Structure formats: structure tokens, C-alpha cells
Amino acid sequence: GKIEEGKLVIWINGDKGYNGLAEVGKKFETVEHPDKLEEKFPQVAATGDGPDIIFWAHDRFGGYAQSGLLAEITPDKAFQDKLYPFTWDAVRYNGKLIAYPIAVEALSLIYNKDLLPNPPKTWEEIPALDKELKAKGKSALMFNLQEPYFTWPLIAADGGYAFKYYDIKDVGVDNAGAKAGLTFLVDLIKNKHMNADTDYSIAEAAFNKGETAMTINGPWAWSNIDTSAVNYGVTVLPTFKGQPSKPFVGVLSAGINAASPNKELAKEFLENYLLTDEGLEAVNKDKPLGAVALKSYEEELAKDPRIAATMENAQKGEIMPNIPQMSAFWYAVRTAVINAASGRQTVDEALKDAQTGSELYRQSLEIISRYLREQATSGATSRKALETLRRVGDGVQRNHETAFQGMLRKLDIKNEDDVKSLSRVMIHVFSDGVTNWGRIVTLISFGAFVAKHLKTINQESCIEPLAESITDVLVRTKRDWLVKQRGWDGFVEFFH
Amino acid sequence: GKIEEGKLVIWINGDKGYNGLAEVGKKFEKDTGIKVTVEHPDKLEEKFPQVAATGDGPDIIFWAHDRFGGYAQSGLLAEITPDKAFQDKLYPFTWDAVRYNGKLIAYPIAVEALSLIYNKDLLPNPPKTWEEIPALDKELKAKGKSALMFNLQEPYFTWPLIAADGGYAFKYAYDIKDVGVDNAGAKAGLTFLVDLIKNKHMNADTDYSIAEAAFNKGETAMTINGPWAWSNIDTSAVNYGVTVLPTFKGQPSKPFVGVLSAGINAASPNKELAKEFLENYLLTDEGLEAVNKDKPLGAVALKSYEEELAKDPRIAATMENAQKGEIMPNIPQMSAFWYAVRTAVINAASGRQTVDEALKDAQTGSELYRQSLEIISRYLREQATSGATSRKALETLRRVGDGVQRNHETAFQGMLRKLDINEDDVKSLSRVMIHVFSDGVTNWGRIVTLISFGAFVAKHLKTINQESCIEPLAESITDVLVRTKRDWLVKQRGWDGFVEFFHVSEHH
Amino acid sequence: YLLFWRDELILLX
Ligand SMILES: OC[C@H]1O[C@H](O[C@H]2[C@H](O)[C@@H](O)[C@@H](O[C@H]3[C@H](O)[C@@H](O)[C@@H](O[C@H]4[C@H](O)[C@@H](O)[C@@H](O[C@H]5[C@H](O)[C@@H](O)[C@@H](O)O[C@@H]5CO)O[C@@H]4CO)O[C@@H]3CO)O[C@@H]2CO)[C@H](O)[C@@H](O)[C@@H]1O
Numbered sequence A: 001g002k003i004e005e006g007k008l009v010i011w012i013n014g015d016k017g018y019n020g021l022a023e024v025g026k027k028f029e030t031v032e033h034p035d036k037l038e039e040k041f042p043q044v045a046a047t048g049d050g051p052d053i054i055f056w057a058h059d060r061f062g063g064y065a066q067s068g069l070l071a072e073i074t075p076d077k078a079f080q081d082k083l084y085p086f087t088w089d090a091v092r093y094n095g096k097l098i099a100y101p102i103a104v105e106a107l108s109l110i111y112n113k114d115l116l117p118n119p120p121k122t123w124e125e126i127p128a129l130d131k132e133l134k135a136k137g138k139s140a141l142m143f144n145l146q147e148p149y150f151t152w153p154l155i156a157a158d159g160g161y162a163f164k165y166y167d168i169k170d171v172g173v174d175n176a177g178a179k180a181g182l183t184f185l186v187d188l189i190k191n192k193h194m195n196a197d198t199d200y201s202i203a204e205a206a207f208n209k210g211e212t213a214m215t216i217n218g219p220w221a222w223s224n225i226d227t228s229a230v231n232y233g234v235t236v237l238p239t240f241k242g243q244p245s246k247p248f249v250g251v252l253s254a255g256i257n258a259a260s261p262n263k264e265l266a267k268e269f270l271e272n273y274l275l276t277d278e279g280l281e282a283v284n285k286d287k288p289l290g291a292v293a294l295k296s297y298e299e300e301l302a303k304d305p306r307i308a309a310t311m312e313n314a315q316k317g318e319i320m321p322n323i324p325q326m327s328a329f330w331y332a333v334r335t336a337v338i339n340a341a342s343g344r345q346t347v348d349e350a351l352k353d354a355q356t357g358s359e360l361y362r363q364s365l366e367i368i369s370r371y372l373r374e375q376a377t378s379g380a381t382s383r384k385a386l387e388t389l390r391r392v393g394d395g396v397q398r399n400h401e402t403a404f405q406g407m408l409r410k411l412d413i414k415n416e417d418d419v420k421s422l423s424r425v426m427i428h429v430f431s432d433g434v435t436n437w438g439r440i441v442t443l444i445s446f447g448a449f450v451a452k453h454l455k456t457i458n459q460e461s462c463i464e465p466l467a468e469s470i471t472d473v474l475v476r477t478k479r480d481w482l483v484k485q486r487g488w489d490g491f492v493e494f495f496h
Numbered sequence B: 001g002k003i004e005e006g007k008l009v010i011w012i013n014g015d016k017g018y019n020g021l022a023e024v025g026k027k028f029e030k031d032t033g034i035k036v037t038v039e040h041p042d043k044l045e046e047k048f049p050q051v052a053a054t055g056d057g058p059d060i061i062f063w064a065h066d067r068f069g070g071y072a073q074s075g076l077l078a079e080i081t082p083d084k085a086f087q088d089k090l091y092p093f094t095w096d097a098v099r100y101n102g103k104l105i106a107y108p109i110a111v112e113a114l115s116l117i118y119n120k121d122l123l124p125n126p127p128k129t130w131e132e133i134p135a136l137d138k139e140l141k142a143k144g145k146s147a148l149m150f151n152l153q154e155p156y157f158t159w160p161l162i163a164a165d166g167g168y169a170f171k172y173a174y175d176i177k178d179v180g181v182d183n184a185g186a187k188a189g190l191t192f193l194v195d196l197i198k199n200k201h202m203n204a205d206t207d208y209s210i211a212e213a214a215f216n217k218g219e220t221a222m223t224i225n226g227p228w229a230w231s232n233i234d235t236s237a238v239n240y241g242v243t244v245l246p247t248f249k250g251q252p253s254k255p256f257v258g259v260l261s262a263g264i265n266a267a268s269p270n271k272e273l274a275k276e277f278l279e280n281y282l283l284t285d286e287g288l289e290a291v292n293k294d295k296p297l298g299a300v301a302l303k304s305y306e307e308e309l310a311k312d313p314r315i316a317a318t319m320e321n322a323q324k325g326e327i328m329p330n331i332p333q334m335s336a337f338w339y340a341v342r343t344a345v346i347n348a349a350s351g352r353q354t355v356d357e358a359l360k361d362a363q364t365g366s367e368l369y370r371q372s373l374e375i376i377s378r379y380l381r382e383q384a385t386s387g388a389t390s391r392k393a394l395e396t397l398r399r400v401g402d403g404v405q406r407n408h409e410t411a412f413q414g415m416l417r418k419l420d421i422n423e424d425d426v427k428s429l430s431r432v433m434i435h436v437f438s439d440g441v442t443n444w445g446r447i448v449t450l451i452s453f454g455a456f457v458a459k460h461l462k463t464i465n466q467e468s469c470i471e472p473l474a475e476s477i478t479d480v481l482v483r484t485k486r487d488w489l490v491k492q493r494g495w496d497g498f499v500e501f502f503h504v505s506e507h508h
Numbered sequence C: 001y002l003l004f005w006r007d008e009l010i011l012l013x
């Protein structure tokens, strides 16, 4: 076969210095900036197609490596000594280096020095500042409310985390600290100090055309403000309830497709061409990377007050997990923020369902997989749910034996793909029209019935894939209903 | 199934004035006390037919009239029963749009058409022709601007240009046999679009968001959009005009005319409450004004509030482009036409397919329903009791299908017993076929076996004196076939591939 | 539902 040989296809997000990266390509001798590339890559790579090299923040790469879609990178100790150790820890999954670290990225408060000589140190004083600036036909603050990357600093301030160092069970999205953060944001919008529909384009336009006094953005944005020649400062993010704003720290990382026949050529480009003072200078000259992983060119650019303040906000923030569940966390919180910002959900309802969303897949898999292996041969919720599944599911099996045996004799399993096919069929059979806990338990109870048959028929290895596949179609087709029922906690309350 | 009683759940597309429609909901809850839930789900036009068939879904579904034909065919819409007074309150052209098989299946709201939206400050005098836009882009590019940006990702926006020199979905007589997607006028239209993109006057990847952004940020001089978009430009503080779409080869642009329609779920126990809301609360001057104030509907079906708003130069130009365009068919396979053409446009815009290859496969996709139904239905009626491809396919279906029935008789009898078919009410559960390709695999063996069992059941229908319910069974099999496997079918050279698959097995 | 399991049409209950 699918992927081109004797050529390198590179995917980097359009907000990064792709034209700089293509100049490095020119020296070496295809750089593309596709939309939704972080969603496309895992899809195409699994069918053996996709780019040779994928550029994204380190947070996405854990999911990719889990799915086997990334080549194990093989650097010289010389090369590893050329980059910061903290950048390698970011790019490490299951004790394997899964991509090449480029640069450390963090949101900072960007302010118009002319409009705002001394920007506010606190979030709490911005509504008063907006009143003052509104009289001059201006605004205090405009940033991207459509992405949870920009909204999270404020949420994480008084209490908020994605994980505990990572404990995939311990997620901090339903906290009273997160409630306060998001309630502050929603108040700014209700008081018309900000607008729910503000995105990256609208905020960048306003700041660069001088209409707003402050924006929240990363190093990539400096080039377009540099063109605007608005006198701009880069500084610490405002404190909320005296606690610092905690932005997620991203590491721009370059990974290689496990399906690329040019894995050698890829290593060369990244090691001997890109991660060189000369090489990083090309990309940074187009769009600034921030504090590059290469210690040498970092030493050169350290002097920049802009980078100094990017690193200042990083110390106060937390590095992103690369675990595979980060994606679900992001999707869930994105919706929480937007639904609260719009008033479609209250902050409590919105944050509650985002907590459920983040944990749903991991929890589902844990519960279902344990039940299936146990029958053959989030922890508190899991324990109680598995306890419930044991009593109820052994009951559904007993009462549905005749129907379950008929179906088993029809749907005989040979491989991982027949196990996958079984899943797609089961959701349809058992969930005729309606989603209710009875039907979901009946589906899992049939999964158990088949897992028992797999042991009988000496295919014990097919159990984990079955559990994976059932979890997949369960969360995919009933995500909203499950989150609406407070997930597995609702399951335990239904059967008490 | 699970539709709740004593409340109304409404689905309307997010590009429409849902917050205005929810304000009408607030008034209704003030008066009748009945709780009104207005939601804007993504892909709601695809969700509704799925959920409604299983007896769930919203009380009221809002979409353009083109989707409602498919819904009514599947029995998912309540037949609306208005006073002649009420019908006389709305425009006759709006009712004809909503009418399927001589039944009114939804309430017409407003008439929609794409117009040329232009920045008055950047472009005081917008171009009258498509052919002069490349020269205009050269001029505007020097100022770091662009002439034209619109949604290339949706065939609604690309179609005006395609239909200009020669292009139709299905010819009115609607002749579902006569489809005009691969003709030389469509080729010229789409070749003009692909030339703009190759000459870097436009970009393949431009969508609704990117085009709206550019126009409202002042970066492009023109966009193509409908009334719904005016509110977001109104906020942008760009001096904007609404005008006639550019002419192509001296022929005017023919945009598809959509009628925002409100339909009621056949499975709603609040059918009474629904009628009240739409007739006496929406589709009243005060009511339409609420929705229009959020997002403009265009020229509303209600003659009274149309008379009020007729003055708008914007609406005048919307109706001007409508006279030049043609109203969308509501026949059920509009869906397949849309999906097919969407891919044609995107593949040509990207260069994945040439215009000829792209339009050719979209012609095959659109024509597949009619031809599939013809072949399948003939076989089924033949078994119970014109076209070159059809004749050979039916010849093949006779030999192979009569064979599959003969060899699988005992298994086929077992399944017929389990379906318990002994009357017409028992026949009306044909959500059996919905999931035939659940494991995700498609081959001609499977498709013949499915049709061969369709024949087996059609023979039982004659036995059970239900001769009339043969065509519905044939229609259901055709539905799942073309709905789920259109691309595979087109990729296999359609029914001609079917005849060659079984020609080969026979002779070798 | 009528279903295909490996080139075999099946009524699955
Ligand atoms: O149809 C409705 C809806 O759809 C559209 O939104 C989708 C986006 O197009 C799509 O890209 C998707 O994005 C996800 C992403 O897939 C996921 O990885 C996560 O994104 C994280 C990054 O992982 C993380 O690095 C950080 O990204 C930074 C990056 O580090 C930084 O270097 C720089 O590039 O800024 C980025 C921030 O934008 O944070 C983000 C999270 O904020 O989560 C994303 C979702 O937030 O998500 C959408 C799928 O729903 C339309 O855009 C939308 O308007 C429509 O309503």
C-alpha cells in the first residue's frame, strides 16, 4: 503493498511549520497537512496504508503504539544524549521509544502591550477589565473555547487532572475544582465577557487586528502576530483562586508507520537532517516550536522571553499522558466544555458525563474481560459491577440456555476475525431496537457463554479478543446511553 | 418502542434556527403545559430512519423535502390531515414538494436556494459568469485575497454549476430510469470546478467551516450559501450582498430548491400535540419570526409572513436563483443520488478519479435502485405466479436462483417456519433484512442467495393469498442492497458484473 | 434478523 517505496510521505498539523519541514525535505531529496490526521492515521495504518512519518503531540502516540501502528525507534546513545531526557520519557510507551521528540509546547497568556501594559495576574479580575475595555470598543480576552487544550488550564487550577502518576482508574473531571474553573468560564460567556462560538481563527483574527487585549495560545501562533506588528508580550497564565493555571504540556513527536517500507530512510531524515541546529531552525523560522528537545539549539533560543514564559507555564502545568485513553478523555471533556459554554448542559451534568466518558472504555474492558476469563476458568465500580455481573449473568445464561446454544451451533468461531464478526452481529441480535441494562447484560452473558465454549473447543487464546470486540461494539453503538446512565455506576444501582 | 408521551421531541439540523424554534417551544409550554425538547443531532437524516423503524426517535423531524419520500415509503411518517383553510394559508408549490404517492407526509416551512454572497467593499460589482472568476482571482490574489470560496465537500453547493450546461437527477414525467449525472453538460460543469482547483483558484479541502471563516474574516470576495448563513455574516460586520449565481456557458446556474419540512413520526403517541405546535404555533407570523430571527429560513411557505419579508433584497435573490434552478425530487433514491454525486465531486476535486470515471460511477449508483428493483421484483413475481443488462441478469437469476432454492429447500423452509408468515400484519416486520451484511462481507453468492430466499418467501406470499406484498419484499431487499453496498456494486460494474460472475461458473 | 455467517443465510433469533 500500500505505502510508496523510495519516498517519504510526512503528515504534520497545519498549525506547525510544514513549509520549514518541506525545506528540510528539499535538502534530503512529500509533506502534507491533512485535516483530522490524528483520526485518519490509525484508520489507514491498520489497512497497511498511511504516511511514512506522522507528526503529533506525544499524547496521541500511546493509542497508536498499543494498536501496533508505530515502528520501535532505534537511536544511538549519542543521539539520545543530544536530546533532553524529559523529552524521551514523554515519547516512551511500555518501556519502548515509539517516536522522536522535537519540541516542548505550552499555552501562555499573550497580551497587547499598548492596550494592556500590565496584564492581570488573576482570572477573577478579567470581568472588571472587560467592562473598562468594552467602553473603548475592545475586549479583555479571546481564545479558542472550541478545543479543550485552551480551556483546561482554568479547569485544572482549583482541582483537575486527566490521570495520577498513569492510574487509568483515577480521573479528576467531576471535582469541585473543575466545577469552579468551568463555572468561571461559563459565567464570562453568560456576562458577555466572551462568546461560546469563539474558535482559533476568530481569536487569532481579534488579537492580530488589535480588537482584544489578551489571547491564550502556543509558540506556533507567534509568526502570525509577528506579521500583525501588534506590540505583544508572552507571560504566565492568570491564577484562579490563587492557584496557578495548569496547561497540558505537549511534545511535538515524529513517529514511523509500522507499515512503511522506508523505516531506514525515515530514521535518517529525523536523526541527521531534522534534529540538527540547521534543521530545527528551518521549521522554527516558519512557525516557532517552543523549547526544542535538541539541547544545543534550545541553549541558543533559551534567551527568548517568549520561550522562557512558555517553560514558566510548563513548570506550573502537567505533561500529557500518552496512554491510549487520552483520546476518550479529550473527546468527553471537549463536549463537556462546549455543552456548558452553550448552556445545553449545566456544569455539574456536563462534567459528570465527561468523567463517565473518559473511564467508559477502560472500565467496560476491565469488567467484561474479567467476567469472560472467570466464567471460562473505577476499581470500586468495577468490583461492584463484576460482583453484579456474576449473580445476574450466570442467571441470564441459565434462563437463555436454549437460545444461546442454538446461536453458538450456528456461529462457530475459527479466528480473531470471526470473533470480531460475532460482536457486530451480537449487538444487532440482542439490541433489537432499545438500549436497556437487561439487553446489555444478555449480550455480555452470551459473550460469557461463547468464552466457556472457547475453553471447551481448546481455543482459550480467542477469549481476550472476544472481550475486546464486545467492549468495542458496546461503547461504539451505546456510548451516549451508557454515559447518560452514569455508566457502570448506574448498572450497579439498577441491580441492587 | 420508547417515544415519551405528554412531551414533544423535535430534531432540526444545527445550520437552522433551533434556538428560535425552542423559543416557540417555551410559548407552547406556557400555553398547553406540554414540554418541548428541540435537539440538533449530527447525521439526524441518517439516524431518524434507523430509530423510527424500531419505534423510537423524535416526535417531529425537520429536513429539506428531498429526504421525506424515503421516510414515507418506509412508513416512518404520519399522514398529515390539514384543513383546506390551512392549505390556502400556505403556497401551493410548498404542498406539491411535501406530497408523496398523493399523500401529504410533512408540513412545509420555507423555500431555500443557494445565492452568490459577495463582499461589497472588496467586490462592488460581482461577476455575472463563472468563466471570468479565474481572471478575478489573479487580481484579488495580488492583494492577499481570493475571488470565491464555498463548500466543495457537499454536492448541494457544487450542483448549480453541474446542472448549468446539462445536468438533472431524474427527469420529470419522475422517470427514475433517466438520470443526468454522466452527460457532457455535467462533465463541463465539474471540469470547470476541477480546473479552478488545478489552477489554485480554489482548494479541494474547502468545506462549510473554511468557506464561512474566509468570507466573514474578509479573506475571500465571494461564497455560495443559503439563507441560514446570513446571521453569522450579519455578526461578522462585512458589508455583504446576496445576488444571482454566476452563469456557466451563458446558461444560468441551477441550484436545487429545498423546502424545510416538518414531519411527524408514525410511532409518536403525541401526533395531536405535534399538529398543534406546527399549525397554530410555528407557521404563524410571530412563530416563524422567532426562528428567522435566529437563522433566516428564506421565503416562508406561510403566504402572510412571506408578504411581510418579501421586501428583503436577500430573499428576492434567493427566489431569483430558485426560478433558474429546479426543485428536488422527494423520491426515495434521492439519498443514493446524493451519496454517489458527493463521492464523484470529491474524487474529481482530489484527482482520485478523472471527471469521466467519477461522474460515470455516480450515474451507475443513482440508476442502481430502479434497475435492482426491476430485476429482483420481476424474478420474485415470476417465481410466485426491456433492458439488455436486466434481460441477461433475470436469465442468470432464473438458472442460479432456481438452483439455490432447489439445493437450500430444507434450510429455507426452516427459516420461513421461524418467521411465522400467517397474514399481511405478520409480513409488516421487514427490519429482518436490515443487518444482512453485519459481518461486513459482500459477494455475488450472498446477493443471489438473499434474492433466492426473497423468491422463496414471494412463493409463500402467493400461497397465503398476499400476492400484493411481493413488491414490498422486493423493495426491501433492493433497499438494503443499494443502501449498504452501492460502492461495491458500482465497483463490480453493477448487474453486468453479476451476469459475468455466473456466466464464468456455468461455462468453466 | 436474516444474516450471513460464511456464505450461509441464517435466521438469528
Ligand atoms: O462534527 C462535530 C465537530 O467536529 C470537528 O472536530 C473534530 C476535529 O476535527 C478533530 O481533529 C478532533 O480532534 C481531537 C483529537 O483527535 C484528539 O487527539 C484531541 O486533541 C488534543 C491533542 O491531542 C493535543 O495535542 C492538543 O492538541 C494541541 C497540540 O498539542 C498543539 O501542539 C496545537 O496543535 O494545538 C492543539 C490544540 O488544538 O489538545 C487537543 C485537545 O484540545 O482531542 C481533539 C478534540 O478536542 O476532534 C473533533 C472530533 O469531534 C469540528 O472541528 C467541530 O467544530 C465540530 O462541531
Ligand SMILES: OC[C@H]1O[C@H](O[C@H]2[C@H](O)[C@@H](O)[C@@H](O[C@H]3[C@H](O)[C@@H](O)[C@@H](O[C@H]4[C@H](O)[C@@H](O)[C@@H](O)O[C@@H]4CO)O[C@@H]3CO)O[C@@H]2CO)[C@H](O)[C@@H](O)[C@@H]1O
Pocket: B013, B015, B043, B045, B046, B064, B065, B066, B067, B112, B154, B155, B156, B157, B226, B258, B335, B338, B339, B342
Ligand atoms: O459519510 C457520508 C456523508 O454524507 C451524509 O449526508 C448525506 C445526507 O444524509 C443526505 O440527505 C444527502 O444530503 C442532501 C440533503 O438531503 C439535501 O436536502 C441537501 O441538504 C442541504 C439542505 O437543503 C440545506 O438546508 C443545508 O443544510 O444544506 C444542506 C447541504 O449541506 O443537500 C444534501 C447534499 O449535499 O447527502 C448527504 C451528503 O451529501 C452525512 O450527513 C455526512 O455527515 C457524511 O460525512
